[PDB]
């Protein structure tokens, strides 16, 4: 399995929210048929790359388990002994079985106490962490002794209670001690070497910080529609202060449950963006005039490439179909709603009439942005702490994103540059290229999962498509769309100038 579907879903949801907010601007800039075809193809390729990264992660994990020396199994046998004997104690009725068990796992634990855990092998024997581990095992042994002492008295019922107590104790200790997550840059390290890791961490962190900047500026570009009592720069100031004051990062994890609300609300927002013109009938005037033979045609290609980007940076077929049914209809409706009038309005609500449904979509996006920032402020801060080693260091980490967002109050252009430069590499070329490079050797080609479905009767096909995507994505995005996006960015910044005050006020 790998249990990466959850992270894939969460990051894809965030990326989908931002993209769905900004898409119609590129949709008109790209043309109906071109937009639809590019969207479908990029979504399928994104799903394929997600599958590739899942395969790589599993391969990496698998090799570890296997090439990893079997030494330190003894703990594992001890732990299995504890589990089985506790289960027997639960099944046990009379005093004889329970006491023999009690002796058995006590001996097992006494063996384990002298065995280094598989986590802190590089530490010194006298290191505090090892001392804490030994102290935990000592309290475990004390609980076992208490349970046995109860057993000798004939109070077999209380022996069960003591066993449950030790079960919950060892759970809350080890299940939170042994369980750990693996980050994809570690996976890259364990496969290719230091050089690729060295140049991959740079890309990952740069993409993370630019995504955070995009997420922040989304709030500025959005909340201004609640009320226009002051420039977007002042509401950006207040919001920047709000998010920075929450510099402290409580350790949060496993956001799968919290992402259901995000999914539902990001579905409702597109529902509004689409149905808000199907029966309203606001369509009139020129709506189809492109596509633009000019390079701008790529301006939207990069923006749509920004979509399906999160699924590969998470690790740091029907799911993409749901994203498709969420995105395509809203894009079509909005394009039909006003058409060519959007190119001067990067966002969507720009032409949305003041009705209660809009006042619900805006707050929905606001709280979604809150949730997304709360979930995505963990990894960049964690790596930055790992970069240099409570918050006497990370406190001003928000100043650079502050001073980067203020310079770029835009929503369409900056997104295009990010998509063309950072994600177009990190999510597309790095994974597939690394996967192809790993399996160059013939020996490595005999310990991997086969082609899942019955569609293709072949094995030298993963090369067929991975040899072509590597060049297609490069030449398409970075070949021309990146140049076009930077040209559009300079065109925008020259119009409103550096440190631009507002944007389409």
């Amino acid at each position: 399995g790998g249990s990466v579907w959850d992270a894939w879903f969460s990051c894809a949801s965030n990326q989908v929210a931002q993209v769905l907010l900004t898409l119609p601007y590129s949709f008109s800039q790209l043309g109906m048929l071109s937009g639809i075809v590019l969207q479908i193809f990029y979504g399928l390729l994104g799903s394929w790359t997600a599958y590739l990264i899942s395969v790589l992660y599993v391969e990496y994990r698998a090799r570890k388990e296997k090439e990893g020396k079997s030494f330190k199994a003894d703990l594992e046998d001890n732990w299995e002994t504890l589990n089985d004997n506790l289960k027997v104690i639960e099944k046990a009725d009379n005093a004889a079985q329970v006491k023999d068990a009690l002796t058995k796992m006590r001996a097992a634990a006494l063996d384990a106490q002298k065995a280094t855990p598989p986590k802190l092998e590089d530490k010194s024997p006298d290191s505090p962490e090892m001392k804490d581990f030994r102290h935990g095992f000592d309290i475990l042994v004390g609980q076992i002794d208490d349970a046995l002492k109860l057993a000798n008295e004939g109070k077999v019922k209380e022996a069960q209670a003591a066993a449950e107590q030790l079960k919950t104790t060892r759970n809350a200790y080890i299940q939170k001690y042994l369980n750990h997550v693996i980050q994809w840059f570690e996976v890259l390290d364990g496969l290719l070497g230091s050089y690729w890791k060295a140049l991959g961490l740079a890309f990952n962190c740069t993409f993370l910080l630019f995504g955070s900047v995009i997420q922040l500026i989304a709030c500025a570009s959005n909340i201004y529609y609640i009320n226009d009592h002051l420039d977007k720069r002042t509401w950006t100031y207040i919001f920047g202060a709000c998010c920075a004051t929450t510099v402290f990062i409580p350790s949060f994890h496993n956001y799968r449950i919290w992402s259901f609300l995000g999914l539902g609300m990001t579905t409702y927002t597109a529902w509004y963006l689409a149905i808000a013109s199907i029966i309203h009938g606001q369509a009139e005037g020129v709506k189809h005039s492109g596509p633009t033979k000019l390079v701008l045609y790529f301006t939207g290609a990069t923006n749509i490439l920004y979509t399906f980007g999160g699924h590969a940076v998470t690790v740091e077929l029907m799911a993409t179909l749901y994203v498709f049914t969420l995105t395509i209809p809203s894009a079509a409706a909005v394009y039909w709603a006003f058409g060519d009038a959007l190119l001067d309005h990067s966002n969507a609500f720009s032409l949305m009439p003041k009705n209660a449904w809009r006042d619900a979509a805006v707050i929905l996006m606001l709280i979604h942005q809150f949730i997304t920032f709360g979930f995505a402020c963990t990894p960049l801060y964690f790596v930055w702490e790992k970069v240099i080693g409570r918050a006497l260091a990370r406190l001003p980490v928000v100043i650079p994103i502050w001073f980067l967002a203020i310079i770029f109050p835009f929503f369409g252009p900056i997104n295009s540059a990010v998509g063309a430069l950072l994600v177009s590499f990190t999510v597309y070329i790095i994974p597939s290229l690394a996967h192809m490079l790993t399996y160059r050797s013939a020996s490595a080609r005999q310990n991997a999962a086969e082609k899942p479905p019955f569609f293709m009767p072949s094995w030298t096909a993963m090369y067929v498509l991975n040899a072509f995507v590597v060049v297609w994505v490069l030449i398409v995005g970075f070949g021309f769309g990146g140049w076009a996006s930077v040209t559009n960015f300079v065109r925008q910044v020259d119009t409103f100038g550096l440190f631009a005050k507002c944007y389409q006020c």
Partner: antibody, heavy 124, light 109 residues
Framework: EVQLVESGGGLVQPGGSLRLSCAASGFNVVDFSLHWVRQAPGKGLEWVAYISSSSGSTSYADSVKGRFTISADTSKNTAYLQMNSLRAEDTAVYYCARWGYWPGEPWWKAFDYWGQGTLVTVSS | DIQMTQSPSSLSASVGDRVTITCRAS??????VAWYQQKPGKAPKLLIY???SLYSGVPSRFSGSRSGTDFTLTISSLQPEDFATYYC??????????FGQGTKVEIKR
């Protein structure tokens, strides 16, 4: 230096009684687990009973269960021992032992400061 | 409850010759064994604890090893005053201690 001592050993007709006490000067026994390892003449050792005066967990051995009674005392820093219904097999020599409490080296070392021991018997 | 064995129930080695005594554990007890150098007529004295370490205050020539369920005692140089019964005993709980049969060393003639 710290030492133990055991007194009160003497012959008794089969079915009598006796009092064995392990006086422990110097080091204190108010938080230590005394034991009693018998030794039948010319045979190997065998554990008999133990007392954890701090909490109280006096458990005997199989061959002696239901016969010995091992009370506790703290003011005299002594742990008594009552014997009932002696048998011809009980004729042996008893030793008072010491055990550091779990966990740590104190506990990791077994009976170390063994006492001089006593000598009882059963005969007619 | 658990059983213990002592294969060399009787040995005899001359002075200046290394000897070794084995002691097998019925179960897989985690070290937690000791060896007592009981003189005839005196109180047994602890020599080795934890199956690997050495008790403080006795010659370093005594040293044992742990091997799965088999514990072995070793004496480098057999000085004349060490010819006395040696008992191997485990300890897994305050009421589960058992002692082996015991080995008697002797002078070769």
């Amino acid at each position: 230096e710290v030492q133990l001592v055991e007194s009160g050993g003497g012959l008794v007709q089969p079915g009598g009684s006796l009092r064995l006490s392990c006086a422990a000067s110097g080091f204190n026994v108010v938080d230590f687990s005394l034991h009693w390892v018998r030794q039948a003449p010319g045979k190997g050792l065998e554990w008999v009973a133990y007392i954890s005066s701090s909490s109280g967990s006096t458990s005997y051995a199989d061959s002696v269960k239901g016969r010995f009674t091992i009370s506790a005392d703290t003011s005299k820093n002594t742990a008594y021992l009552q014997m009932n219904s002696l048998r011809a097999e009980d004729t042996a020599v008893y030793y008072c032992a010491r055990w550091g409490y779990w966990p740590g080296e104190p506990w990791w070392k077994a009976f170390d400061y063994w006492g001089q021991g006593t000598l009882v018997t059963v005969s007619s | 409850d658990i059983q213990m064995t002592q294969s060399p129930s009787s040995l005899s080695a001359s002075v200046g010759d290394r000897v070794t005594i084995t002691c097998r554990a019925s179960q897989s007890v985690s070290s937690a064994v000791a060896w007592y150098q009981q003189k005839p007529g005196k109180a047994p004295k602890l020599l080795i604890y934890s199956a690997s370490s050495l008790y403080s205050g006795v010659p370093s020539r005594f040293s044992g090893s742990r091997s799965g369920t088999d514990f072995t005692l070793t004496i480098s140089s057999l000085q004349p005053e060490d010819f006395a019964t040696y008992y191997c005993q485990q300890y897994l709980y305050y009421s589960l201690v058992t002692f082996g049969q015991g080995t008697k060393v002797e002078i070769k003639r």
